[PDB]
């Protein structure tokens, strides 16, 4: 009851957001009274032939919008005239479904044609359609004479158009430009002309029957023929269906809200776009759902139900009851709906009384694409925790082609004129091919979608071939939509191929096919022709035999990036060039790992990372069964290489990368004899690792040994990290753990006073995220990436886009990886993340509108259908509202990143300064705004890795002694270590510890941020960096006489002290005197 | 600027010129110092100093007192620079709880040396306005390319193993 009532308050208020006033409909219907009066004086002329029609209109202003093919005098026997038609109302304003929209809409003022003006043979040879193209220009010829005489044409204009973006019915449009003034309502009047109800035979105008006899089945040509008669009877159904349901219009408004979010409307989809089923068909489906819906005409939706029940059930019927390849929908307007379990390889919504397909407007490419969003939106009505009203319609899903899809390429279609298509394309395009798909915009639209269907197949989730630059408008003094754009004579500039790829098959090299035999089978005939020399005989691993094709792997593009150029080369256009230059340079921003087949390694190739997990498992294999005084029970690494969170891919013998040694947290048996002192705690566990080193030194000469202290724990200086590098070249930093670590931390908090309790708590969080909650996040890090491996391709590069802009020095990699993993578990309203370009652009838009004060981060570590419950996630909401009492603007608690394991929100994002977080969002605001304004290009694509380092009182440019890019395992290498292992650190990043002391001493007056990965972020040499630093706001004013100001300040008077920048610039300069190259002082 | 030699609470200021830099364009680094008042045993003849120079250590306080010994015709010595935690690694002791920032303490060997060196300290404090070219420059320590990775190098196990054996005994 809370899933409906909280939705109903989100439905009733949202319908009030788009509340159309009665003032806007007043002058719009009163202008129709000036339209109905002026049309009532439109007289009928005399009947004339086809030849006399072109004689009267060639010297007149009005011209006939004749569709292809135009009429010819050698085949024209009948006559043509104009008549006084019966105008009526249809659509949204006839069912009271209209609402306020800023972009505007069309008011479907229907004009029914006279029945006596059409012959019995009107349905064939385009006879009645030749009457409608002549009478619509004739009615525009009479009304423009009438509207000029009423002097309204100063702000009113007339032009040509088409109904529902279908070119088979010429129509005129009336609007208002900037008593009868409807320019304040912004409603356009579509002067639609329809034929009389079954004036031709509806049984002869079914889908399987043809009306171009010169036959093959014309499902789309009969769709424009038969549905021209159903404008009155089907509207009479939804007129009475509005009276039987209290929330028919309210749920169709939310149906109009949900369908407009993903690009679905009454625009046609066979012409190379997405659509064909929108507000018109959903209100028709709501009439079929409120009049039955079962397989034996049982009920699917209720009549007395509200908007919360009718909106969710219809789209779930659009998701769970198939209509494309498995079944079909039935309807009857003249008696229940009963779903037919046989499909026709397309969308087919059967009108049994009217014999026309109500789902004929959508093609096979646009039918299944809405169903993947339908099951996504119906699952949002099934969730019992999250609010899903804003996730449906108030979040625009149709903004960018790189957002809702995985990849979109610009394949220019320089096809030229229609008669030159014998040499332009490989296809034979004649009159019989142009019988049902007569418009040339539709003919290559499904052909290239089918040619890509053998190319990709199951490598994507859908197919969308988009016609970019194609409009629907024309002048009434012109013939149709003609253009000289793109060097061609088509109804588009070019075409773009868009698809959402599934990562488990999008980069497969072995293009699978059917089995071989003694004779070439019919299933093997098509695949052999489609590949040719690319098709060869290749056997399986278990002994099976089939015809298959091997592809080429690359580190900049997937396997389908060649096949989108391959399958478009053969059967689409020999001169068309398809290329995806956005995701090509995006993969070049990642680190190129020094391994074999590095340029031949796709983004899905994670074999190099798991091969480093083999050596550490071989390293732990000598550790686990070894006898010590204390036996081992836990041998696990919490490093970034085993969690796929390292910015550098794990290459052997790589000493220069900061993520070289994958961190290890190990545990011994339960022991009360551990000492209860902090210095004695790490003194004892290092002794058990000393004998474990003495077991590794005795009979394990393949692996090396060295010791180092980990100073990442504040106030703990007794800890020791065991560094063991194996014979292959992979090293691990081994640290022990027991039950005394959190014992010494919590006893340090309660015993200490109210003064020093905070810093020993944050240093306890340093012992929590590294020892207590280290393996807990490391278990779910490798686990849930098995549902979307593109998170491991993105979050390694999203930090690489963050490390280039001087952000790595203040935030940990876990909170950076959980930021890019928010569009994986909660990808709404977009699709599943499946590429590095899709993953980075999802993080670019989500971190832009990430207001850290009002909404915190609670991302479920759950695989595809382990998450926190409704009572548990509301407890995570309790951490936000109580912390915002003393930290309301995000100055003391900004990034609340929480999950099921750590609902405190401040695990990896506590102790960080707020001002770097303000630029972390500002670099997410300006980078995403540049994509929609200036477009997406490689000038802007590498610009996100280009920081200007402005707003800086300090900017230090430096250069190190040894360039260490090749030493870190980055192929622009690492083969062996030295004889003594102490000399291996001479090729490390010297600015890592040089900036580590920078934030250490001068924390109270300087804000030190720098790069920790200098090998990839140095350019060519792999040793260059830059540090941006800002002064504090409290030390920007004069501070009085005190001892503990902790600021490197000078004398300004006998009473005040101020931080003089002269010694402040030299203090970081005299430390890094060997690295002293340049320093900017303002 | 130069007219503030003695503060409000009595802290005698130490104005000292900064060294010249390749990445920079007479820059000064200012310190404050006064006699610390406490009845501690080993903190006798010790001066609590505020905002000591960059990379200062025990050799920095003997060289500064050495030029102070040549200046005012005095003879004195320093004992030890106490609690000089420039990095803050000993700012919190976590071993105790489980069982004055940016300031230093420059202790002298005797009160005969500490009273004379503080007498020269007020004399050298008057060099801000009288002779600003006579202000003694701070020869700060500069980290090389060798000692920068010395925290990244591995430790000597001859000091770690025998001491952890003493930590267990």
- Nearest C-alpha of chain A: how many angstroms from B55? 7
Q: Which of B22, B92, B140 sits opposite A760 (nearest CB)?
A: B92
A1009: which 2 tokens? 């941020």
In sign, the C-alpha dihedral spanning A297, A301, A302, A303 is negative
Distance set, CA A449 to CA A466, A499, A922, A952 (Å): 10, 11, 41, 52
- B88 and A CB contact within 8 Å: yes
**Stated resolution in angstroms:** 3.8
Query: Do the bridges between strand A706-708 and strand A721-725 make them parallel or antiparallel, or are there none, so unpaired?
Result: antiparallel
Q: Report cis status (omega within 30 of 0) of the bond before A798.
A: no
Bridge partners of A636?
A665
Q: Which residues in B lie closer than 8 A to residue A1027 (C-beta atoms)?
A: none
Same domain (yes/no): B66, B127: no
Torsion of CA A399, A400, A403, A405, to 10 degrees: 110
A279: which 2 tokens? 């507000």
Q: Report cis status (omega within 30 of 0) of the bond before A69.
A: yes
The C-alpha atoms of residue A323 and residue A330 are separated, in whole angstroms, by: 10
CA nearest to A623, candidates A713, A696, A706: A696
Q: Give me the helix-helix angle, A307-320 and A2-17, nearest 10°.
A: 100
Taking a C-beta distance cutoff of 8 angstroms, is the pair A84, A44 a contact? yes
Bridge partners of A1042?
none
CB contact under 8 A, A715 and B15: no
Same domain (yes/no): B99, B129: no
φ, ψ at A107 (rounded to 5°): -95, 115
How many separate domains does chain B show? 2
CB contact under 8 A, B168 and A684: yes
Pairs from A10-16 (Cβ < 8 Å, separation ≥ 24) = A10/A387, A10/A389, A10/A390, A11/A250, A11/A254, A11/A307, A11/A308, A11/A311, A11/A389, A14/A254, A14/A257, A14/A389, A14/A393, A14/A394, A15/A99, A15/A250, A15/A253, A15/A254
**Residue numbers preceding breaks in chain B (C to N > 2.5 A):** 25, 99
Question: ∠ at Cα A662 (A660, A668), nearest 5°?
Answer: 150
Tell me chain A's radius of gyration from C-alpha atoms: 35
Q: Which of B143, B160, B167 sits opposite A680 (nearest CB)?
A: B167
In what helix (H) or strand (E) does residue A582 lie, and over which residues does it extend? helix A582-586
CA nearest to A630, candidates A667, A679, A578, A662: A667
The C-alpha atoms of residue A752 and residue B95 are separated, in whole angstroms, by: 12
* Residue at a domain's end among B109, B131, B152: B109
Starting at the edge strand found earlier in the chain, the sheet holding A1050-1051 runs A1039-1040, A1056-1058, A1050-1051
**Hey, is A271 helix, strand or coil?**
coil
A561: which 2 tokens? 């990036």
Q: Which residues in A lie closer than 8 A to residue B143 (C-beta atoms)?
A: 994, 1071-1074
Q: Which residues in A lie closer than 8 A to residue B7 (C-beta atoms)?
A: 1041, 1051, 1054
CB contact under 8 A, B161 and A711: no
Same domain (yes/no): B96, B128: no
CA nearest to A992, candidates A973, A1008, A971, A972: A1008
**Hey, is A48 helix, strand or coil?**
strand
Count, residues in chain B:
169
Question: ∠ at Cα B31 (B29, B35), nearest 5°?
Answer: 165
Q: Check residue A96 and give left, alpha or beta (phi > 0: left; psi -120 to 50: alpha).
A: left
Tell me chain B's radius of gyration from C-alpha atoms: 19
B5: which 2 tokens? 């030699």
* Interface with chain B: mutation pick from A1048, A1068, A1076, A1078, highest number of B CBs within 10 Å: A1048
Taking a C-beta distance cutoff of 8 angstroms, is the pair A348, A289 a contact? no
Q: Which of A678, A759, A1071 sits opposite B98 (nearest CB)?
A: A678
Taking a C-beta distance cutoff of 8 angstroms, is the pair B36, B15 a contact? no
Same domain (yes/no): B64, B75: yes
A792: which 2 tokens? 């491991």
Q: Check residue A487 and give left, alpha or beta (phi > 0: left; psi -120 to 50: alpha).
A: left
- DSSP track, A119-174: -TT-TTTTHHHHHHHHHHHHHHHHHHHHHHHTT-TTT--EEEEEGGG-TTSEEEEE
**Domains, chain A, ranges and CATH?**
1-19+195-204+245-400 (1.10.1410.10), 20-194+228-244 (no CATH), 401-509+553-579 (3.30.70.3020), 580-949 (no CATH), 950-1082 (3.30.70.3030)
In sign, the C-alpha dihedral spanning A618, A619, A623, A624 is negative
**Full domain range(s) for residue B100:** 1-109
- Scanning A1026-1055 for CB atoms below 8 A from B yields 1041, 1043-1051, 1053-1055
Taking a C-beta distance cutoff of 8 angstroms, is the pair A326, A347 a contact? no
Taking a C-beta distance cutoff of 8 angstroms, is the pair A255, A318 a contact? no
**Which residue in B has a C-alpha nearest to residue A995's C-alpha?**
B148
Q: Residues near A1023 by Cβ (< 8 Å), separated by ≥ 6?
A: A959, A960, A961, A962, A963, A964, A965, A989, A1014, A1015
The C-alpha atoms of residue A485 and residue A576 are separated, in whole angstroms, by: 15
- A49 and B CB contact within 8 Å: no
**Which residue in B has a C-alpha nearest to residue A986's C-alpha?**
B149
**Which residue in B has a C-alpha nearest to residue A996's C-alpha?**
B87
- Nearest C-alpha of chain B: how many angstroms from A1047? 7
**Which residue reads 């989100």 in tokens?**
A10
In sign, the C-alpha dihedral spanning A19, A21, A24, A28 is positive
Query: Do the bridges between strand A329-331 and strand A349-351 make them parallel or antiparallel, or are there none, so unpaired?
Result: parallel
A410: which 2 tokens? 């610009």
A37: which 2 tokens? 């009066």
CB contact under 8 A, B15 and A1051: yes
The C-alpha atoms of residue B106 and residue B62 are separated, in whole angstroms, by: 10
**Hey, is A569 helix, strand or coil?**
helix
Pairs from A90-95 (Cβ < 8 Å, separation ≥ 24) = A90/A192, A90/A231, A90/A232, A90/A235, A91/A235, A91/A280, A92/A279, A93/A25, A94/A235, A94/A239, A95/A235, A95/A238, A95/A239, A95/A242, A95/A248, A95/A249, A95/A252, A95/A283
Burial A467-496 (b: 16+ CB within 10 A, else e): beebebebebeeebbeeeebebbbbbbbbb
Distance set, CA A509 to CA A472, A503, A505, A552, B163 (Å): 41, 13, 9, 7, 59
φ, ψ at A679 (rounded to 5°): -70, -30
Taking a C-beta distance cutoff of 8 angstroms, is the pair A276, A363 a contact? yes
**Which residue in A has a C-alpha nearest to residue B94's C-alpha?**
A715
Same domain (yes/no): B139, B80: no
**Hey, is A158 helix, strand or coil?**
strand
The C-alpha atoms of residue A1059 and residue A1051 are separated, in whole angstroms, by: 9
Q: Which of A715, A1043, A1051 sits opposite B103 (nearest CB)?
A: A1043
Question: ∠ at Cα A842 (A910, A901), nearest 5°?
Answer: 40
- A1000 and B CB contact within 8 Å: yes
Q: Check residue A198 and give left, alpha or beta (phi > 0: left; psi -120 to 50: alpha).
A: left
- DSSP letter (8 states) at residue B6: B
**Which residue in B has a C-alpha nearest to residue A677's C-alpha?**
B99
How far is C-alpha A385 from the geometric centre of its chain's CA atoms?
23
A86: which 2 tokens? 């019966």
The C-alpha atoms of residue B34 and residue A732 are separated, in whole angstroms, by: 50
A768: which 2 tokens? 């929590």
Taking a C-beta distance cutoff of 8 angstroms, is the pair A193, A136 a contact? yes
B18: which 2 tokens? 């900064």
Same domain (yes/no): B64, B39: yes
Q: Residues near A74 by Cβ (< 8 Å), separated by ≥ 6?
A: none
Q: Which of B92, B101, B103 sits opposite A756 (nearest CB)?
A: B92
The C-alpha atoms of residue B49 and residue B64 are separated, in whole angstroms, by: 13
Q: What is the 3-state secondary structure (H, E, C) of A310-364?
A: HHHHHHHHHHHCCCCCCCEEEECCCCCECCECCCCCCCCEEECCCCCECCCCCCH
In sign, the C-alpha dihedral spanning A1066, A1067, A1072, A1073 is positive
**Hey, is A580 helix, strand or coil?**
coil
- Nearest C-alpha of chain B: how many angstroms from A870? 39
How far is C-alpha A250 from the geometric centre of its chain's CA atoms?
29
Same domain (yes/no): B164, B89: no
CB contact under 8 A, B100 and A1043: yes
**Which residue reads 């509200």 in tokens?**
A306
**Which residue reads 């603007």 in tokens?**
A889
Q: Which residues in B lie closer than 8 A to residue A751 (C-beta atoms)?
A: 97-98
In what helix (H) or strand (E) does residue A410 lie, and over which residues does it extend? strand A407-411
Query: What ranges in A415-548 are assigned the alpha helix state H?
Result: 421-424, 440-455, 522-531
The C-alpha atoms of residue A688 and residue A235 are separated, in whole angstroms, by: 84
The C-alpha atoms of residue A1005 and residue A1047 are separated, in whole angstroms, by: 6
CATH code, domain carrying B123: 6.10.250.2760
- DSSP track, B92-137: S-HHHHT--TTEEEEEES-HHHHHHHHHHHHHHHGGGTS-GGGSPP
In what helix (H) or strand (E) does residue A545 lie, and over which residues does it extend? strand A545-548
In sign, the C-alpha dihedral spanning A207, A208, A209, A213 is positive
Q: Residues near A578 by Cβ (< 8 Å), separated by ≥ 6?
A: A409, A410, A411, A497, A564, A565, A568
- DSSP letter (8 states) at residue A592: -
**Hey, is A380 helix, strand or coil?**
helix
**Hey, is A1020 helix, strand or coil?**
coil
Bridge partners of A537?
A547
Q: Which of A747, A1047, A1072 sits opposite B102 (nearest CB)?
A: A1047
Q: Which of A690, A1041, A1044 sits opposite B100 (nearest CB)?
A: A1044
Largest CA distance in chain A: 113
The C-alpha atoms of residue A262 and residue A830 are separated, in whole angstroms, by: 9
CB contact under 8 A, A720 and B15: no
Q: Report the Cα–Cα distance between both ends of chain B, in Å, rounded.
A: 58
Same domain (yes/no): B123, B93: no
Q: What is the 3-state secondary structure (H, E, C) of B127-162?
A: HHCCCHHHCCCCCCCCCCCCCCCCCCCCCCHHHHHH
Q: Which residues in A lie closer than 8 A to residue B165 (C-beta atoms)?
A: 687
The C-alpha atoms of residue A952 and residue A806 are separated, in whole angstroms, by: 12
Taking a C-beta distance cutoff of 8 angstroms, is the pair A87, A111 a contact? yes
Q: Check residue A389 and give left, alpha or beta (phi > 0: left; psi -120 to 50: alpha).
A: alpha
CB contact under 8 A, B143 and A760: no
Taking a C-beta distance cutoff of 8 angstroms, is the pair A456, A463 a contact? yes
CB contact under 8 A, A1067 and B54: yes
CA nearest to A718, candidates B163, B101, B97, B151: B163
Q: Which residues in A lie closer than 8 A to residue B167 (C-beta atoms)?
A: 679-680, 683-684
Taking a C-beta distance cutoff of 8 angstroms, is the pair A631, A1008 a contact? no
Q: Give me the helix-helix angle, A364-380 and A307-320, nearest 10°.
A: 130
**Which residue reads 């950076």 in tokens?**
A816
- A977 and B CB contact within 8 Å: no
Q: Give me the helix-helix angle, A248-261 and A307-320, nearest 10°.
A: 50
- B16 and A CB contact within 8 Å: no
**Which residue reads 């060097």 in tokens?**
A487
A725: which 2 tokens? 């590098």
Residue A423 exposed, middle or buried by CB count within 10 Å (0-12, 13-18, 19+): exposed
- B169 and A CB contact within 8 Å: no
- DSSP letter (8 states) at residue A474: B
CB contact under 8 A, B54 and A686: no
**Which residue reads 């006579």 in tokens?**
B134
**Which residue in B has a C-alpha nearest to residue A994's C-alpha?**
B148
The C-alpha atoms of residue A238 and residue A287 are separated, in whole angstroms, by: 7
Q: How many CB atoms lie within 10 A of CB A587?
A: 20
Q: Residues near A555 by Cβ (< 8 Å), separated by ≥ 6?
A: A587, A592, A598, A599, A600, A601, A602, A603
Q: Residues near A22 by Cβ (< 8 Å), separated by ≥ 6?
A: none
CB contact under 8 A, B94 and A759: no
Taking a C-beta distance cutoff of 8 angstroms, is the pair B95, A719 a contact? no
A313: which 2 tokens? 């059930």
Distance set, CA A657 to CA A606, A662, A896, A971, A1023 (Å): 19, 11, 29, 13, 11
**Hey, is A997 helix, strand or coil?**
coil
The C-alpha atoms of residue A660 and residue A664 are separated, in whole angstroms, by: 12
Q: How many CB atoms lie within 10 A of CB A963?
A: 20
* Residue at a domain's end among B83, B109, B135: B109
Taking a C-beta distance cutoff of 8 angstroms, is the pair B13, B5 a contact? yes
Q: Report the Cα–Cα distance between both ends of chain A, in Å, rounded.
A: 62
- DSSP letter (8 states) at residue A390: T
CB contact under 8 A, A1070 and B54: yes
How far is C-alpha A22 from the geometric centre of its chain's CA atoms?
39
**Which residue in B has a C-alpha nearest to residue A1058's C-alpha?**
B30
Q: Which residues in B lie closer than 8 A to residue A706 (C-beta atoms)?
A: 154
Taking a C-beta distance cutoff of 8 angstroms, is the pair A977, A655 a contact? yes
Q: Which residues in A lie closer than 8 A to residue B161 (C-beta atoms)?
A: 690
Same domain (yes/no): B83, B133: no
φ, ψ at A513 (rounded to 5°): -145, -165
- DSSP letter (8 states) at residue A1021: S
Bridge partners of B81?
B106
Taking a C-beta distance cutoff of 8 angstroms, is the pair B148, A990 a contact? yes
Q: How many helices (H) and strands (E) does chain B have?
A: 4, 5
- DSSP track, A788-800: -TTHHHHHHHHTH
Taking a C-beta distance cutoff of 8 angstroms, is the pair A547, A527 a contact? yes
**Which residue reads 């014979």 in tokens?**
A727
A421: which 2 tokens? 């298509």
Q: Identify the experimental approach.
A: cryo-EM
Same domain (yes/no): B161, B141: yes
* Residue at a domain's end among B88, B109, B130: B109
Same domain (yes/no): B138, B150: yes
CB contact under 8 A, A985 and B103: no
Burial B19-33 (b: 16+ CB within 10 A, else e): beeebeeebbbbbbb
**Hey, is A665 helix, strand or coil?**
strand
- DSSP letter (8 states) at residue A202: T
Residue A233 exposed, middle or buried by CB count within 10 Å (0-12, 13-18, 19+): middle
Same domain (yes/no): B46, B118: no
Q: What is the 3-state secondary structure (H, E, C) of A879-919?
A: HHHHHCCCCCCCCCCCCCEECCCCCCCCCCCCCCCHHHHHH
């Amino acid at each position: 009851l809370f899933k409906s009532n909280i939705f109903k308050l989100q439905i009733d208020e949202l319908l009030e957001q788009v509340k159309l006033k009665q003032k806007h409909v007043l002058k719009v219907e009163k202008f129709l009274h000036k339209l109905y009066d002026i049309l009532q004086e439109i007289p009928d002329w005399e009947e004339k032939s086809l030849a006399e029609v072109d004689s009267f209109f060639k010297n007149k202003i009005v011209s006939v919008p004749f569709v292809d093919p135009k009429p010819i005098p050698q085949n024209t026997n009948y006559k043509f005239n104009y008549k006084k038609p019966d105008i009526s109302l249809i659509g949204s304003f006839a069912l009271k479904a209209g609402i306020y929209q800023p972009n505007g809409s069309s008011i479907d003022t229907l004009l029914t044609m006279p029945k006596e003006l059409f012959e019995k043979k009107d349905f064939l040879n385009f006879r009645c359609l030749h009457k409608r193209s002549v009478y619509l220009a004739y009615l525009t010829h009479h009304l423009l004479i009438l509207l000029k005489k009423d002097k309204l044409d100063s702000f009113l204009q007339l032009e040509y158009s088409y109904f529902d973006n279908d070119p088979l019915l010429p129509i005129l449009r009336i609007s208002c430009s900037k008593d009868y003034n409807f320019y304040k309502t912004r409603f356009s009047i579509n002067l639609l002309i329809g034929f009389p109800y079954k004036v031709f035979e509806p049984k002869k105008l079914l889908p399987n029957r043809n009306c171009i006899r010169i036959l093959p089945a014309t499902p789309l040509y009969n769709f424009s023929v038969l549905s021209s008669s159903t404008h009155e009877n089907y509207l009479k159904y939804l007129y009475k269906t509005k009276k039987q349901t209290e929330s028919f219009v309210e749920a169709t408004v939310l149906g109009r809200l949900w369908l407009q979010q993903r690009g679905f409307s009454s625009n046609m989809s066979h012409s190379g776009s997405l659509g064909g089923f929108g507000t018109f068909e959903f209100t028709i489906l709501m009439a079929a759902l409120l009049n039955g819906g079962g397989i034996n005409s049982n009920k699917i939706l209720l009549h007395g139900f509200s908007s919360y029940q009718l909106f969710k059930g219809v789209i779930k019927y659009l998701a769970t009851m198939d209509l494309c390849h498995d079944g079909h929908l039935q309807f009857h307007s003249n008696p229940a709906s009963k779903y037919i379990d046989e499909g026709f390889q397309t969308p087919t919504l059967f009108d049994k009384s009217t014999k026309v397909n109500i789902l004929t407007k959508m093609t096979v490419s646009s039918y299944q694409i809405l169903k993947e969003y339908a099951g996504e939106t119906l699952r949002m009505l099934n969730n019992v925790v999250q609010d899903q009203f804003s996730n449906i319609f108030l979040t625009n899903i149709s903004r960018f082609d790189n957002l809702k899809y995985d990849l979109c390429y610009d394949v220019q279609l320089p096809l030229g004129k229609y008669n030159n298509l014998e040499t332009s394309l490989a296809a034979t395009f004649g009159s019989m091919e142009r019988v049902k798909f007569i418009t040339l915009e539709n003919f290559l639209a499904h052909k290239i979608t089918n040619v890509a269907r053998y190319a990709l197949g199951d490598r994507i989730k859908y197919i969308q071939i988009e016609m970019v630059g194609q409009k629907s408008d024309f002048p009434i003094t012109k013939r149709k939509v003609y253009s000289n754009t793109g060097g061609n004579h088509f109804n588009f500039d070019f075409v773009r191929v868009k698809l959402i790829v599934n990562p488990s098959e999008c980069d497969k090299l072995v293009t699978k096919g059917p089995a071989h035999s003694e004779t070439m089978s019919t299933e093997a005939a098509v695949f052999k022709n489609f590949w040719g020399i690319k098709s060869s005989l290749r056997r399986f691993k278990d002994g099976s035999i089939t015809h298959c094709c091997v592809w080429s792997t690359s580190s900049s593009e997937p396997i389908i990036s060649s096949i989108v150029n391959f399958a478009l080369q053969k059967h689409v256009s020999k001169k068309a060039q398809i290329s995806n230059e956005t995701i090509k340079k995006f993969h070049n921003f990642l680190p190129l790992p020094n391994l074999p087949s590095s340029a031949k390694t796709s983004v899905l190739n994670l074999s190099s990372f798991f091969n480093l997990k083999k050596s550490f498992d071989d390293l732990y294999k000598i550790i686990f069964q070894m006898k010590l005084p204390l036996s081992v029970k836990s041998i696990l690494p919490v490093g970034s290489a085993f969690r796929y969170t390292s910015l550098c891919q794990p290459v052997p013998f790589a000493y220069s990368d900061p993520d070289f040694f994958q961190d290890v947290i190990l545990e011994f048996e339960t022991s009360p004899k551990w000492p209860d002192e902090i210095t004695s705690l790490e003194k004892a566990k290092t002794a058990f690792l000393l004998k474990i080193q003495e077991e590794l030194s005795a009979n394990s000469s393949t692996y090396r040994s060295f010791f180092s202290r980990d100073e990442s724990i504040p106030y703990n200086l007794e800890i020791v990290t065991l560094n063991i590098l194996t014979p292959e070249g992979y090293g691990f930093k081994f640290r022990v753990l027991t039950e005394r670590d959190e014992i010494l931390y919590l006893r340090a908090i309660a015993n200490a006073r109210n003064e020093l309790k905070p810093e020993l708590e944050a240093t306890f969080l340093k012992f929590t995220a590294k020892y207590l909650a280290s393996v807990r996040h490391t278990r779910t890090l490798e686990n849930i990436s098995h549902s979307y491996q593109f998170y491991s391709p993105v979050v390694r590069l999203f930090k690489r886009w963050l490390d280039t802009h001087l952000l790595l020095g203040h935030i940990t990699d876990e909170l950076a990886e959980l930021i890019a993993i928010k569009p994986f578990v909660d990808p709404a309203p977009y699709f599943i993340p499946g590429s590095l370009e899709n993953g980075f652009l999802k993080v670019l838009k989500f971190i832009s509108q990430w207001n850290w004060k009002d909404d915190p981060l609670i991302l479920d570590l759950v695989k595809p259908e382990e998450r926190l419950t409704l009572a548990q996630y509301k407890g995570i909401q309790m951490n936000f509202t109580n912390l915002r009492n003393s930290d309301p603007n995000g100055t003391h608690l900004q990034f609340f990143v929480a999950s099921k394991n750590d609902p405190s929100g401040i695990l990896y994002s506590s102790g960080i300064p707020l001002p770097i977080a303000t630029r972390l969002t500002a670099l997410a605001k300006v980078a995403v705004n540049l994509l929609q304004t200036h477009g997406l290009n490689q000038q802007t694509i590498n610009l996100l890795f280009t920081p200007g380092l402005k707003d800086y009182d300090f900017v230090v440019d430096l250069r190190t002694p040894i360039g260490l890019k090749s030493s870190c395992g980055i192929l622009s290498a690492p083969s062996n270590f030295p004889e003594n292992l102490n000399d291996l650190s001479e090729k490390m990043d010297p600015t890592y510890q040089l900036v580590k002391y920078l934030n250490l001493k001068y924390k109270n007056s300087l804000i030190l941020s720098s790069r920790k990965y200098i090998g990839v972020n140095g350019g060519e040499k792999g040793d260059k960096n830059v540090i941006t630093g800002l002064i504090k706001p409290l030390f920007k004013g004069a501070h009085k006489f005190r001892v503990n100001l902790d600021c490197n300040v000078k004398p300004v008077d006998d009473e005040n002290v101020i931080l003089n920048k002269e010694a402040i610039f030299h203090e970081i300069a005299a430390f890094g005197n060997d690295m002293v190259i340049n320093f900017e002082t303002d | 600027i130069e007219d503030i030699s003695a503060m409000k609470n009595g802290f005698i200021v130490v104005p000292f010129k900064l060294p010249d830099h390749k990445a920079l364009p007479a820059s000064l680094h200012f310190m404050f110092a006064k006699r610390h008042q406490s009845s501690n045993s080993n903190e006798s003849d010790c001066l609590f100093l505020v905002n000591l120079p960059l990379l200062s250590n025990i050799e920095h306080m003997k060289k500064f007192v050495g030029q102070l010994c040549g200046k005012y015709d005095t003879v004195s010595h320093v004992e030890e620079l106490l609690y000089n935690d420039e990095f803050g690694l000993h700012e919190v002791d976590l071993s105790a709880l489980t069982s004055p920032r940016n300031t230093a303490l420059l202790k002298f060997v005797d009160a005969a040396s500490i009273n004379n060196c503080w007498n020269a300290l007020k004399k050298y404090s008057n060099l801000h306005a009288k002779h600003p070219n006579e202000l003694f420059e701070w020869t700060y320590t500069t980290p090389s390319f060798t000692t920068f990775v010395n925290f990244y190098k591995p430790l000597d196990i001859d000091y770690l193993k025998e001491d952890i054996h003493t930590h267990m005994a």
